[PDB]
Structures are given as structure tokens and as C-alpha cells.
Amino acid sequence: TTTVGITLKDAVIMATERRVTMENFIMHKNGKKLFQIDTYTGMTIAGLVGDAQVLVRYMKAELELYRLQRRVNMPIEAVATLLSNMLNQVKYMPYMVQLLVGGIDTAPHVFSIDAAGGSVEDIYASTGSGSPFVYGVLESQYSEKMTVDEGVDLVIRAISAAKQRDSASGGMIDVAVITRKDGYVQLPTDQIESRIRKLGLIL
Amino acid sequence: TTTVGITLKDAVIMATERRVTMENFIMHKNGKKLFQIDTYTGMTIAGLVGDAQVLVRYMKAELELYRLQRRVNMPIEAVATLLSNMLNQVKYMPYMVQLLVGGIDTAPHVFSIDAAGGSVEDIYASTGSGSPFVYGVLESQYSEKMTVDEGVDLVIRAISAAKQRDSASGGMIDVAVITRKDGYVQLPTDQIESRIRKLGLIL
Amino acid sequence: TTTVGITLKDAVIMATERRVTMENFIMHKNGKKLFQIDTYTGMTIAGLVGDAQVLVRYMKAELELYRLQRRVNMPIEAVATLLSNMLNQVKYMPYMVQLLVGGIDTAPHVFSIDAAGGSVEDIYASTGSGSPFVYGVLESQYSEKMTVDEGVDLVIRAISAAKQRDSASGGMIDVAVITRKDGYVQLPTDQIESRIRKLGLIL
Amino acid sequence: TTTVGITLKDAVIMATERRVTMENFIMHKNGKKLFQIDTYTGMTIAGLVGDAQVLVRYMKAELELYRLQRRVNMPIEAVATLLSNMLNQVKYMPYMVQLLVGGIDTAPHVFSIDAAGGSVEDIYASTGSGSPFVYGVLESQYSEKMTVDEGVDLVIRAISAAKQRDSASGGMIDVAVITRKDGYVQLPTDQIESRIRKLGLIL
Amino acid sequence: RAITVFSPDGRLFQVEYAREAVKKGSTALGMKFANGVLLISDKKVRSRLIEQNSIEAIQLIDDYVAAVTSGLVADARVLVDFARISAQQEKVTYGSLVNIENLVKRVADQMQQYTQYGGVRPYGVSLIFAGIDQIGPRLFDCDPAGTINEYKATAIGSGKDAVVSFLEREYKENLPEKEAVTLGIKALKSSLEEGEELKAPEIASITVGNKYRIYDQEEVKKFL
Amino acid sequence: RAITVFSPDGRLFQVEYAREAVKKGSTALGMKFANGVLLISDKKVRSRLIEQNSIEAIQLIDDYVAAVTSGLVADARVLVDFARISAQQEKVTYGSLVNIENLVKRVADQMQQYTQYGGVRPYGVSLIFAGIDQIGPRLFDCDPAGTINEYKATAIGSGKDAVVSFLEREYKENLPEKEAVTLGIKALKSSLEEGEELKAPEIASITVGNKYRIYDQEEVKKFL
Amino acid sequence: RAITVFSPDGRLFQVEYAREAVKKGSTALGMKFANGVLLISDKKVRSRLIEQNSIEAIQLIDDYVAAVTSGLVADARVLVDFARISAQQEKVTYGSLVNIENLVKRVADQMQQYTQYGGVRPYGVSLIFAGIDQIGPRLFDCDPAGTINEYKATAIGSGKDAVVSFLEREYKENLPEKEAVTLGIKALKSSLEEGEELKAPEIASITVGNKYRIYDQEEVKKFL
Amino acid sequence: RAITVFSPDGRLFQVEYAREAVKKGSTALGMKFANGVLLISDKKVRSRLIEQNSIEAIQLIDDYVAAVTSGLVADARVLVDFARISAQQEKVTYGSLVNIENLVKRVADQMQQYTQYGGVRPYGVSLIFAGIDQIGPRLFDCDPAGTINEYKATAIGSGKDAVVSFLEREYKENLPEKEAVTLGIKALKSSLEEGEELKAPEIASITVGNKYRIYDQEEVKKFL
Amino acid sequence: RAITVFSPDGRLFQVEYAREAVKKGSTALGMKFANGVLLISDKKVRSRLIEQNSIEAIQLIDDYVAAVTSGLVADARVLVDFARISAQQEKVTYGSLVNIENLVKRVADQMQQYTQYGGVRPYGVSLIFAGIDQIGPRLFDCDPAGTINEYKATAIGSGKDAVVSFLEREYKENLPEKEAVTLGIKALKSSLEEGEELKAPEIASITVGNKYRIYDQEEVKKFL
């Protein structure tokens, strides 16, 4: 699997592949690894499937209860701290997962959490099997002076490189841009195919 | 063992073989791996026999209690989420099983659940020992523009390929089509033998 | 060890050998592996001796309490479901046993239960060390159009083949026929020796 | 990773690198390993990331509750004793971490705590992967007659030697000087780059 | 005198006081017919703001056991939910609901417990259970002490005694379903026609072999 | 005075009040004969709506111990189920029900506990147990305090004293089964023929060696 | 008489005394309209020092269930938080809040418990729940005993009876949202205009499909 | 009448009796100003042997929440320590104290519990909490039942009503800190100048962004 | 009125009754001097058979905290042992006894608990704690409710009020140790010289920096 999250000027772009295996034997050509966790923040999944879906259900529940009790959204540092305490309260019956939670509160953030619950900020991050490839291309091409369109083009080029050079990733890429103005908006597959055919990555 | 579940236009077809072993030593030439779990949804079994029959008893009980308390059937996403939470509350004394639950509520669904409780949707799925063969033929012949008759013919051709090319599967195939109009109807063995003799798979 | 259970027209015949070892070293030339579990159903034993005798005591107790509380006998599906739930509530301090419970309620049944609690019906079944031999002869000679006498002759021929071709089995065969009319009747050893001397299996 | 803590005349200087890996695969070029734990004392981290961040959260909480209940800061011997009892109450589900807590109460201190909770004082200490290098240069150049500027120059020369000769360390060095007069002050990155360019360590 | 302890002569005053609490409830009744059993609750929808059909006093315990209750409605709902999960326990354990008498006995043991112990009041609720099992059609009553009795026809509620008098006179054992629900409605009428109105009641039936069928609003008015 | 604590002179008032609660029940009795023992409960089927034969007050504890009860019927059913599972415990542990006296003693200890502690009332129920063991035919009584006594013939219920007077006069120790059930019915008659009716009673017997036999409706009317 | 035990005739005195405690509260009401449901609490901001808008009596349980309460405000806040975490439990377990009736039933079971046991007083609070589920718009009431009833329109508080009389006369079932909140305000007026003032009330609505919308201060004065 | 159970009409007598216990305490008050909030406790140092400044009734819960209490001083200290460790729990779990309303709500739930259960008296203590969070300046009250209300300015203690009358007349919402503490002292004066003395009071303030500042002895006498 | 529940007006009657129990005890007092603090208990050795010096009412809690008690002597010994093991807990956890105020607060929380709950009477004992910490010399009082107050000089016992009046008049803050113990003995005299005898009292002191010193029999008679 592969995930990618990019913080740029006033936005954060998170995208995944959709191919779930669950065996060697790729089994599901259209999974779901990009989850909206709250009205201004999302979460991506790069580990064991069942444990991570339990994590997504729990975090949706806790952040919705939070927004209800306090009439305001949770900050990104708070949700990563919560997620880290959850993963680190049990590490000897552990969750084998690599979580990546991004979102915007007053400034965009994308935080990475390992299986031991080490929350750490970075301006771009990636997790999964085909992760060093997208770290390579994001080390070579990413600039923090990008727009949203250049950012999502960079993200699609990244996940296309990971799909070309890795067995575990693959399938149709899905991308969601979360910004403060329009909120959390997941791009439809027509615009994603449009950017794939425009950037010369289709085969 | 082998299972198969296909979602098509307004129906879902699930079929299994019937041969249970329980040893190397095939022991029961007529088992039962296709279970009706509720009046519009069914469940198929591809793991350790005892654990899976306990799972079928529990899910029959919980969905019947649900339909009684709420006067409506359970959705398919809810039953897969319930089944995933059940399998993932205990994974260090784990259930070694691969469940596949299909059914129709307002749109047909067939969901796959591994031993760790990773629920994931797909338009056709299969589990068991002789599963890659039916994934091969369903990759080559399946179209979503089929009727019910072309669908059940595809399913019988699939399980016939798996019976021909695998030791663990075998025995008389049993098929059940669940649709919204006529509900859950399991085909009698006479029609199954009729389709076997018609499609040129009998030997 | 070896057990055998046959469902025929309106009866079920269950027979065992009687040789218990408990070591390599055959130690008891006359054990007891065929137990009447209720006034119309019986149970046979093919595993570790102590655990299985505890199982027989518990099932005698539970079915007698059942018949007392409800003034009717328990069905065979219910006793196999009960026995499966008992063996599967504890499988990590497990019972190493292969149970086979037969009986008649409104139709004859003989159900097989493995060590993991996978209850499954079959029209004839066998468990134990010398079990594939009696599966061979019951695959070659059994017809469902038999009487009771042809059935018990088939059973004695089966267990005689298993005694001839296996070390763990042996000793004097004991047989019990359970039918709805005369109930559960265990044949005396004189009739068993008579059938052995008649069928030409004595040596 | 590498940490360094130096006690000199009336001050204590603690500095770390900022590179977190979390894999082999250096992943975060700007982490955070130097934490202010109270208004006159700080803590440095050289172990597993998640466990150590949990430790930092707990010690911030306990020392803030302490300062609130007693209207005075905690001594350094007390915070190391507390931290040692915390790490040694659980050592068979242990924390794999090497903590180093420095600070000033009436005299400067820097205490080292291993994973088993052995608190021990020293006038300079270091933990982490690239720790023997900074012990080498602090054995060769450190004198207790230094000022604050000579001390922070020594610290930057140390961590520069560790960044040059070790894979696990690296990234931008961050330094904090804690003294009784001005309290806990972390140097801005401009002064750190100024000292790097002045001492002839930039490349 | 003020908790479940015995009387100066052999009475449990709280369990009595619970029986007069279930005398203050809404009437309901049930009866066996030739091959099944019916339950008719009076439903007296008082205001027009009540969502008439969505309040249900005939509640299902399983697809093959139903129950109608009378008394304190909160204790009713809690006890009916206990009966539901107990039926589910027997489905998990034995594979099927072989005896409906076991199901009424476990619920009645639950009521006997709070009849027995201090620090808790008795369940002020009475129920009747109906359905077929392997034995056949059964109709049970349940009492604030946990007393069960098996009937061919019984009542509960404010019109306990008047309905039971009519049933005591005019009940015929083997009866087709149509004439059965007619006799039941005449019973419910004679008692409840003291407010000079009945209403449309609610009524469910089973014939042995089939599942459950609760009538709709239109069908009951034909027999009304 | 109002919970199980002692009197001004040596009385447990609640356990008394339970004994007058079991005096308010239905009468039943039992007696040994030459090679077994019988239990006859009066069954006074009051209404015609009660499912006459399906209500049973002679209930089986094991295929070789039976019990008939009197008093509060809910406490009766709970205690009889405790006796059933205790007999099953002894079957699991020792292999057979060697002594029926052990079975009455464990049940009586269960009754002594709620005689002993506060926060619970005593069991307001009395029972008699009957059956053969390795020792032979035994007939026991059980009292709201947990007192047990062994009889050749005993009674319980509303007709305690009248029946015990007739048994005190007219009992013969070794007696064939037919004349035994005749003597028992004459006992039940003389007491219960104050409402100038008896009815068909219910009656079970064992002869040592055989299992249990409860009569049917037709056989008891021959001795009636 | 002084804890939840039964009356000399069939009454739970403490649960009554809780109902008169919720009669002493602030009035609130709710009603279904054509495709949703509204809740209007009177908010009578007494002093000028109270932070008018930040005190909220219409509180959200989920993005698809809201609640307005009346009675003891502390028991109100605790029970509403229990409802919140129970809705979250159903989101974790089943994936969605399929029935709002299950949500009111679990809360009402929680209230029945402290109606049932000794050593605890009943919850002296009454609530109404509103929202859409898969079934559609639902509006529930909740009573100190744990009694639930489903309405098309209901009230709670000091103006229980006056508001319910106006609703009993003037309610129309299918109604556009604007005329619905107008009818609700007229209801709240007729009762609460005995202190010859109403104020700006607080009011929330849902139409099926959308999430929750609580009005602001300016919008409610247009309908006032 | 003598434990937390309900009244003949809707009153919790013990929670009342706790409110008159907190009426017998020392007065204190608090108010928001333009960009922060202040708390002034009267401190009436009675004897000269009391270590004047070391007794503190304005106590810190966190560097961004403070509290001043009134009533039974022992229950005060225990409850304030509970608030301290609860704030620390939220710092451990979420990383920061995002809402001070959550902090007052957990403490008030703790007070509601001993309002709810038997075998424990209510907390006879009242508190006001003050501080800034992400939302801004907040000032809360807390009541022996667990009732919370949010104010711009409030009081507590023996001079509850007199101070609240002065605040009700003379409070201005947006106010510089100097004139704010002057208005607060005039409030504390008008009430407590019935013993014809005030003393130096104790007073703390926050402006949003900064940490906590408790005055010293010299600074408060300038505003006195 | 007879357990820790509230009064008709704001009083805890049992905690009062405990305060009059500690008024019935033996008097003791303590005071700070220039660089330490002293505790003087009256010891009135009544009979000649009491082992005069071995009975000690000034007991050590740590080498840097001492305590003298008054009231019920059994509750005194149990509470003083709790204070000892709590000081030892803080030595194990933090390495040193940094605050003596924390030590009096934990003991006072222990007393507040049995002030708070039912099923236990309050601790009928009062104590004063003395010693130096990092902050300096501290002298605390402890009250049957768990109330603590910090003094420069305080008393406890039968001569509470008379001694506190003398201290209220004649205490000087900074005082050498000799004149301090002289002033303390004059205080103890003026009160206890109503039986026209004092005796040799027992008295301990600390100056900041040193450990504990309890006088011997000979030294106290020089100041007597």
C-alpha cells in the first residue's frame, strides 16, 4: 500500500491507492484507505486492514462526540495525541499499522503515527509499502510555494511512480484536498482521470 | 473449500461446494457452508468448521434479535461491521476463518471479511482453498450486465473449474440467489443438475 | 481405536471395539467406548480417555436434566450443537477427542464432532485410529435399502476389517442398535459371537 | 539519535539533533527531542519515540500539578527519582528509552536515567546512538571554568562531530540553555546557524 | 410491611401491592384456537397526537414467541427485553427454541428474584406469552410473584375479572381463527364498553407451522 | 420482629410467618408402601380454562427422586429447579445419586441460609421428597427453616393436620401398592371433602428397581 | 412511602415525586413537520449577567439526534451525556445510528433502573428526543419512570398541560417548516404569557437528509 | 426527608440543606473584564495568629484555570484537588486544556453523584471557576446539586444576594482591568461593610494570552 | 441528625459531636519561634502506676515532622500511624518530604472521607503538626471535619479557649527558644492551673537545620 499527505500554503492534500491484499494474491481492486475523520480533517491507513478499520471507527466516534460536547472541532495535535495514547496503551497485543492524519485548524498539518504511537509533524509524509518512492519524488519536486493544482498534480505523479515501481500498491488513485475555505472535498474520479491523462501517466 | 459471491444488477448469487475435511482424508461428502443469516442476506464459510458454525449461530441470533427490536432488517454494512468487531475483539485466541456475507437492502452487496476482521466491499468475491481458480474465471467472463440466469451459469462454471483443479473442494454444488423481489431463494438440486448437464460440465 | 455409526431406514447402528491404550502397550482388553447418552440416543468415543469420560458424564447429566425439565427427549441437532459449543468454549486448553453421537427423534441421525466442535451430519460416519478401513468397506458395501440385520452384519464386517488391519483397535466388538420402536438396545455378546461365526470372520 | 547535557558554573546546556527514524529510512528531518519539562528544568529523549513522548506528557503533567499544589518548583533529584520509579514499576513490559533530565534549583544538575531506571548524576552526560563521539570530545575539551558561550560552542562542536560520524543522528541542531537568572531559554535557529558558521563546522 | 418480608399471617405485602399496580393497567387477553393462538391487546389511543400504530403492546420475543403486557409500562419494556435476549441465548446454545415454557420460566425466575431479595421492589408487571413450540400451541400467564399458569384463554389488566367471566362462560376449545378473534373481541367489548367505546384493538395470531402475523389497522375493523 | 432475628423468647417470626404461608397452600401427601413410595397431590383444577394435566405439582428431580410441593408456587418452582441441578451435580461428581438424604440436605441448607441472613426473606415453601436410593425407599419433609424429617407417611398444605390425623390412626407399614393409593386417597378425601368435592388428584409411585411412573387421568379415577 | 417500594394501592411515590419535580421546571416542546422535526425550548434568561446564548437546553446527542430537557438540570446534564456516549457506542458497534428508538430505549432503561433499585433516588428529569433515522422523523418523550411515548407533537415542563391543550386543538400533521415554528411559538406563547412576556426562545430543526441547524438570535425574533 | 430522596412536592432536602450550608460561608465573587477575568475572595483574617497570606481561597487548578470556593472548607479542598487532577488528566489525554467548560462539567458530575446516591451526603460546597481557553474568557458557577451556570459576573457565600444586587445594577461588560477590580471591590464593600470593616481582600486576574497573576499584599491596598 | 447528613440549617451534627469529643480531651499547644517550632503537651500523669515518660502524646511522624494530638486516644494513635506511613510514601516516591502541608492535607483528606460517607463515624480527634520543610517552619491544626489552618501558635484540648486567649494577647512573632518555651508554659499554666497544679509537661522543639529533640524530665522543670 501507499499513502501520501502534503501540507502546502493553506491546504493539505491526502491521497491513497486502492488495492487491498489481505493475502499475496491481490484480492480487492477497489478498497478504501482514505477516510474523512472530521469535517476539517482526514486519516489515511497503511497497515493491517481490520485493526485500522477499527481505529477509523473509534476516531470518527470520538471526534464526533468531541465536536458535539464542545461545539468546535478538535485540533490536529489533539487528535494525534489521542491516537498515540490509544496505540500506546496496548503495544504488547499491538496494532500493526502506520497511520497518517492530516487536517487544518488555523494552519495546515499532517502528522505521522507509527505502530508504537510516535506522533511527529512533517510538512509532507508517506506511509505504506510503496512509500520510499513517493518520498523520493517529493524530495525532488516538492516546493512549499505551490498552489492546490500543482500540489495535486505532484501527488498524482508520486502515487503513479509508486504504482509503477511496486507490487503491493496499485488500483485507482483517490485524492482528497482539505482546505479551510471549502472544507474537506474529495475529488471525483473524472477529474483524477483527467489529471492522469493530462500529466502523461496513463498506460 | 471454495465459496463464491457475485453482485449483479439487482441480485446477489452465492454458492459453495459441499465437502468438509476436518482431516486430509475427505470425510463428509455433503456438508453445509451456505447459510441464510437473515430474510434478505446470507453468509458463506471458508475456514475452520467449528469456529465458523459458532459464528453462524451467533450472527443468526444477533440479526434475529435486531429484526425483532427494530422491525426492519439490518443493512449489509452493519452486519459486516458487527462481524468485523466480533472477529477483532479476539485475535490472539483467534478465529481462523474467511467469511463472506452477501445480501441486498436497497442495493446488492457482497462483503469479504478475513480472519482479522477487515471488512471490504467488492462486486464479486471468493474465499477458500480453491479460490484463485474462481477468481480467474470471474476475471475472464464476468460482466455486470448479466441477468440472474447468466449469473448462476457463471457461478456453476466457476465452482466446476475449482472442483476440477483442486483437491480440497468437491462434492455437490449448492447455490442460493438472493434478490429483493422473491427474497432469499436457494435453488433445488434438480435445477443445479440441470444447469450442470446443460453447460457441459458433467462427467 | 475405531467407532462406526450407520443411519439406515428407521434405525441407527453404532458399534465400537473394546481395547484401551492409554500407553503403547495395550492395557485394557475390555474397555467401554459405546455410551447410551439418553433413552433414544447414544454417543461413541475416539479420543483421550479421561477427557472423553468427563464429556460422557456431562452429557448424560445435561440430557437427563433436559428430559426432566421438558418431559420430552432432546433432538439430535440440539445435542450436537450443545456438544459443539462445549468443545469450542475451550479450545486453547483443548479436548483432544473425536465424538460421534447418533440417535433417532423423528428421523435417524448420526453426527460427527471433531476436537474443535465442528458438528456435521452424515448418513454413516466413523472416528478413531482404525477409521479409514471402515470408511473403505462402508464406501464399498453400504446401501441405504438395508434392514437392521444386514446393517449390523455390515458393521461387524467393518470393525473386523479394522481389527485385522490396525494395531490400536482390537478386542471384543460391542454393538448397539437404536430404533424408535424398541428404543436403545445393545446386543448381547452371544449374538455378536453368533454373527462373527456366521459371517466367517472368526479366527 | 544524540543528546548532550552539560552542567557548568551556574547553568546547564542541553541540546539535541532533530532527525527521527522510526525506520532505517530516515523519515522526519525535523523532529523534537528537547522538551521543557518545567519552568526551570528540561528533558531530552533518546529512545523509542512513542514511549518517550508518553513519558514527556506524563512528566509535564506531574510537575505542573506539583508546582500548583506546592507553589514551588520540584528539585532535580525529586524529578529523577520520580522518573526512575516510573520506569522501574514496569520493566517486564518495559520502556526502551534513555532519558536525560537537566535543570537548576539552587545548583545546576544533569541526571541520566537508563531504561531500568538507574538515576545517576554527572557533570556532563549524553545518550543516544551517536553518544560516544560527544563523550569523546567532551572528554577532550570540556572544562568546568567555562562561560555560557564557550559551553554552547562546545555543545555545537560535539553534536557536529556526532552528525559527521554517525548515520542515525543529523538534521538541524537545537539547543536550550537553562540558567537561574533568565530561566529556560531555547536559542533561536538564527543564533545556532551563526555559531555553526562562526566555528567553521558548516558544509 | 414495607418490603418483601412476610406478613403477620402469610402474605407478601409488596407483591400484593404490585398486583394492584397491574390491576391499574390496560386490559389485554389471549386465547388458543384450533391450530394456533391469538393475543388481543386493547389499545386505547387517548390523544390524537400519539403515533397510533407505532406504540405496540403486543411485542415479539422471537419469530415463534410473542408477548402482551400490562401494568407499569417501563418494567414491562425492560422485562420483555430480558425475555428477548433469553430466547436468543437458547437459540445460541441449543439451536432452536424447543420449549416456550422454559422461556416463561426463566423470566418468571427473574421476577421471583426481586420478589425474594431486599433492596429492590418486585416487578410490577404482568404478561401473557403465546406461541407454538415442538409441543404445540401454548399460552402462559406471568404474575408479579413469578407465578406462571397455562391457559387455553386468559386475560390481564383492568378488565381482568369481567373478561375472565365472559371467557369462563363462552369459550369453546377448538375454534376456527375468525370465530376465535370474534369471541375475543366480544370479550374485550363487554368489559371495556363501560366507557361506552372500545376502539380498534391490536391483535396478533399464529397458526402452527407459519411465522407471526400482526394485523393491520384495516383488518381488525372488519371484526370490530 | 420484622426480619430473621430472634424473638423476646426464642422464636424466628419470619420463619413462623413462612410456615403460615405454607399452611395457606394446596394439600398434598405421600407414603411408603411395601417396596416403594407414592406421592399424591390434590390437584383442584378450579376453572375450565386451566390446561388440567399440564400444570404439574409432582415434579421430577431425577429419574430416581421426585418431589411434591406446597406453599408459594414461585418459590416452589425455583427451589425445585435448585434440587434438579444439585442432583445433576452429584451425578457429574460421584457417578450416581447414592443418597436421596444428601439431596434433601443440600436443598434444606439452601433454605437455612435465607432463614439465617438479613436482606432476604425465608423461602415460604414446604416440600416432600420421595424415592429409592441404595438404602431403599425414603420419604422426606422440608420446612421453611430447612428442617428435614424422615417419614413413612406425611402430609403438607391446607390439609396438613386432618390428613396427618388420619395417617396417624390408619397407616399400615407394609402395604401393596393398590391398597396404598386407596389409603392415600381416603386420607386426601377426609380432609378435602369439606368443599364437598375432591376431584381427580395426581399421584406418582415407584417400586424399588423400576423408574418413575406418573399415572394418567384415567387410572386415578378407578381408585377415586 | 419514602423509597421506591410500592404504595398501599399501586403507586411509586418517589417516581411521582420526581414527576412533580419535573413539573417545576422550564417548559419546552417539539413537533414534527412535513419532512422533519423541531424542538423549541423556552429560554427565559432571567438576569442580564447570564451568558444568554451559551446556556443551551437544546443539546445535540448526535448529528442526527437532538434532545431538549426539563426538570433538575444536573440530572439533565448527566443523562444527556449518557445518551451521547450511548449513541457513540452504537456508531462504534453497528456503523450508524439506525434507530433513534433504540437510543431513547437505552436511556429509559437507565432511568428504569434507578426507579427499580433501593439506595438511589429516581432521575428527576424528563426529556424529549427528536431526529430522523432510516425510518424517518421521530419525536419521543421520556418520563421519570423510564416511560417512553412517541408523538407527532409534545411538551414538557411547567407549561406541560396548557401547551398540550393548544397542541391537542390546533395541530396539523403535514406542515411547512415556517408555519410549524409559528404554531410552536403560538403554543409556547399561550402558556408562558402568564408572566406577560415570553422572550426570544431557542429552537432547532431538521429536515430529512440534512444535518442539524440551531437558529441564531436574529432568526427566531422574526417568528416571534 | 433525611437523605437524598424526593420531597412531598419536588425538592431534594439534603441538597437544599447543603445550599444553606454554603450560605453560611465566606463571600467571594468574580467578573469578566475586557480581555480577561478576575476573582476576588474576601479574606477576613480573624485572629493575628493566622498566617495571613498562606491561607489561600483562590487556588489554581492549572496555569490556565483558577477557582475560588465557599462553604465547608474541607469539602472545598477535596473537590478542588479533584478538579486539579482532572485538568491534569485532560492534559495527558488531549495535550491541552481546550475547554474550561469540560473541566467544570466533570467536577459538577462528581457533585451530582453524591446528590444522586444514598449512603453519602452531598458536597456542601460552591465554587466559581475562571480562566481563558481557546474560546476565550469564561466564568462558571457550581452549586451543591452540580448545577453550573455561566456568568459575566457572579458571587458566592454569605454576601451572595447583596453582591449580586450590586452587580445586577452596576456591571459594565467591557471594562479595563483597573476599573474592573475597583468595581469588584465596591461590590465586596457594600455587602461586607455590615461589620463596618472590609480588610485587604485577595484577588487574581488573567488577561487572555498571559498566565496567572495573584496580587501581593501591597497592590490590593491601592485599590482598597 | 444521627449520621453525617445535613441539618435543618447547614450543620453536620456528628462532626459537631466529634468537636465536643475533642473538647473533652487533654490540652496541648504549639508555637513557632525565631528559627523553629515547639510543641508542648500537658502531660497530667494521674496515678503513680502509669509509666510516666513512656506514654508519649508528642509523637514523631518523620525526623522532620512531629505531631501532638488531643481527643479520643485510639483514633489518635490510628491517625498518627496513617500520617507516619504517608510520610514514608512520600519519601519513597519523591525522595524527600518537601512539603509538610502536603502531609497534613493527606491526613485531613482521610478525615474528610469519614466526615463524608455513611456507615462510619467521623474521626473524633484533633491534631497539630509542627516542623520545618524546604519552605521553613510550619505549624498546622487539624479538625474533625478535616479542616486545616496554619498558625504561628495554636492550642487544642480542654484548654483550647483559655490558652488561645493568652496566645492572642501575649504572642511575639520572633522569639528565642528559651523565652518561647517560657511563654508556652505560662500559657499552659494559666489554663490548667484551675486544678491548682500543672505538672511537668512534655515539650519538643526544632530549629531549622537540625533534627528532632524531645526534652528529658530534668530540663522541662528548669522552665517550669
3-state secondary structure B134-150: HHHHHHHHCCCCCCHHH
Query: 46-105 in D: which are within 8 Å (CB) of I?
Result: 69-70, 72, 74-75, 77-78, 81-82, 85
Residue whose cell numbers read 409534545: G154
In chain H, what are the domain boundaries? 1-224
Give Cα B106 distance to the centre of its chain: 19
Closest chain A residue to the Cα of B111, Cα to Cα: A28
Contact D176, D186 (CB under 8 A): yes
Question: If you count residue pairs, one on G and one on H, with CB atoms under 8 Å apart, how many are there?
Answer: 83
Cα angle, residue B129 at apex, residues B126 and B134 outer, rounded to 5°: 40
Mapped onto helix, strand or coil, the DSSP state of residue H223 is: helix
Report the half-sphere exposure of A43 (CA within 13 A, side-chain side).
25
Select the residue from E49, E55, E126 to test the G interface by mutation, using most G Cβ atoms within 10 A. Answer: E49
Q: Is C175 left (phi over 0), alpha (psi -120 to 50) or beta?
A: beta
Alpha-carbon span E129 to F168, nearest angstrom: 45
First to last CA, chain D: 20
Alpha-carbon span F33 to F183, nearest angstrom: 10
Alpha-carbon span B56 to B21, nearest angstrom: 18
Question: If you count residue pairs, one on H and one on I, with CB atoms under 8 Å apart, how many are there?
Answer: 81
Cα angle, residue G179 at apex, residues G176 and G184 outer, rounded to 5°: 120
> C touches I (3+ CB pairs < 8 Å)?
no
Alpha-carbon span A44 to A56, nearest angstrom: 9
A132 and D49 within 8 Å at the Cβ level: the answer is: no
Alpha-carbon span G212 to G221, nearest angstrom: 20
Contact F70, F156 (CB under 8 A): yes
* A148–chain B nearest CA distance, Å: 31
Cα angle, residue E194 at apex, residues E189 and E198 outer, rounded to 5°: 40
Contact D19, D163 (CB under 8 A): no
Cα angle, residue D77 at apex, residues D72 and D82 outer, rounded to 5°: 85
For residue B31 the three cell numbers come to 456438508
Give the one of H50, H77, H121 whose C-beta lies nearest to I6's C-beta.
H121
Alpha-carbon span I2 to E176, nearest angstrom: 69
Question: If you count residue pairs, one on D and one on H, with CB atoms under 8 Å apart, how many are there?
Answer: 23
- Residue G55 buriedness (CB in 10 A; 0-12 / 13-18 / 19+): middle
Experimental method: cryo-EM
* B118–chain A nearest CA distance, Å: 4
For residue C53 the three cell numbers come to 469420560
Select the residue from H53, H65, H92 to test the D interface by mutation, using most D Cβ atoms within 10 A. Answer: H92
For residue I39 the three cell numbers come to 510543641
- Residue G204 buriedness (CB in 10 A; 0-12 / 13-18 / 19+): buried
Q: What are phi and psi of D26, to 5 degrees?
A: -60, 130
Residues of D in contact with H91 (CB under 8 A): 57, 60-61, 64
> G touches C (3+ CB pairs < 8 Å)?
no
Closest CA to D6 of I135, D15, C75: D15
Q: Is F219 left (phi over 0), alpha (psi -120 to 50) or beta?
A: alpha
Beta-carbon contacts of A144 under 8 Å, excluding residues fewer than 6 positions away, are: A8, A9, A123
| C-alpha dist (Å) from residue B180 to A80, B39, B111, B125, E192 | 44, 10, 17, 20, 43
Q: Tell me whether the omega of the peptide bond preceding residue G111 falls within 30 degrees of 0, making it cis.
A: no
* H173–chain I nearest CA distance, Å: 35
Write the secondary structure of H79-116 as one string of H (helix), E (strand) and C (coil): HHHHHHHHHHHHHHHHCCCCCHHHHHHHHHHHHHHHHH
Residue B61 contacts C, CB cutoff 8 Å: no
Which residues make beta-bridge pairs with H158? none
Alpha-carbon span B197 to I142, nearest angstrom: 96
Contact A13, A5 (CB under 8 A): yes
Query: 126-155 in G: which are within 8 Å (CB) of H?
Result: none
For residue D74 the three cell numbers come to 520540584
**What subunits touch chain H, counting only 3 or more CB pairs under 8 A?**
A, D, G, I
Residues of E in contact with G154 (CB under 8 A): 49
Q: Tell me whether the omega of the peptide bond preceding residue A86 falls within 30 degrees of 0, making it cis.
A: no
G92 and A64 within 8 Å at the Cβ level: the answer is: no
Beta-carbon contacts of E82 under 8 Å, excluding residues fewer than 6 positions away, are: E107, E110
Residue G90 contacts B, CB cutoff 8 Å: no
Alpha-carbon span A75 to A64, nearest angstrom: 13
Give the one of G96, G102, G135 whose C-beta lies nearest to B78's C-beta.
G96
* E39–chain C nearest CA distance, Å: 24
Closest CA to E204 of E196, E214, E212: E214
Contact C121, C111 (CB under 8 A): yes
Give the one of G10, G149, G171 whose C-beta lies nearest to E55's C-beta.
G149
E149 and F18 within 8 Å at the Cβ level: the answer is: no
- Residue A145 buriedness (CB in 10 A; 0-12 / 13-18 / 19+): exposed
Alpha-carbon span F54 to F56, nearest angstrom: 6
For residue I23 the three cell numbers come to 473538647
User: Residue ranges of the alpha helices (H) in chain D?
Assistant: 49-70, 76-89, 131-141, 148-164, 189-198
Q: Is F146 left (phi over 0), alpha (psi -120 to 50) or beta?
A: left
Closest CA to D155 of D1, D2, D22: D2
Beta-carbon contacts of E196 under 8 Å, excluding residues fewer than 6 positions away, are: none
- Residue I55 buriedness (CB in 10 A; 0-12 / 13-18 / 19+): exposed
Alpha-carbon span H177 to H204, nearest angstrom: 11
Active site residue B1: yes
Beta-carbon contacts of B201 under 8 Å, excluding residues fewer than 6 positions away, are: B156, B157, B160
B82 and G93 within 8 Å at the Cβ level: the answer is: yes
Closest CA to G72 of H108, H210, B143, I187: H108
Residue whose cell numbers read 489552618: I149
Alpha-carbon span A67 to A72, nearest angstrom: 5
Q: Tell me whether the omega of the peptide bond preceding residue B22 falls within 30 degrees of 0, making it cis.
A: yes
Active site residues of C: 1
Contact A18, A172 (CB under 8 A): yes
**Neighbour tally for E90: CB within 10 Å:** 18
Alpha-carbon span B130 to B166, nearest angstrom: 6
Q: Tell me whether the omega of the peptide bond preceding residue B86 falls within 30 degrees of 0, making it cis.
A: no
Alpha-carbon span B101 to B41, nearest angstrom: 7
Cα angle, residue C8 at apex, residues C5 and C13 outer, rounded to 5°: 35
- Residue D89 buriedness (CB in 10 A; 0-12 / 13-18 / 19+): exposed
B31 and C81 within 8 Å at the Cβ level: the answer is: no
Contact E144, E19 (CB under 8 A): yes
| C-alpha dist (Å) from residue I175 to I10, I36, I130, I204 | 41, 10, 17, 16
Residues of D in contact with H84 (CB under 8 A): 65, 68-69
Strands (E), chain C: 3-8, 11-16, 34-38, 41-45, 99-104, 108-113, 119-121, 124-125, 174-179, 183-186
For residue G152 the three cell numbers come to 407527532
Closest CA to E39 of E125, E117, E141: E141
Alpha-carbon torsion angle E73, E75, E77, E82, nearest 10: -160
Beta-carbon contacts of B115 under 8 Å, excluding residues fewer than 6 positions away, are: B47, B87, B91, B94, B95, B96, B97, B98
Q: Breaks in chain D, named by the residue before each, with C–N above 2.5 Å? A: none
Cα angle, residue B131 at apex, residues B126 and B135 outer, rounded to 5°: 70
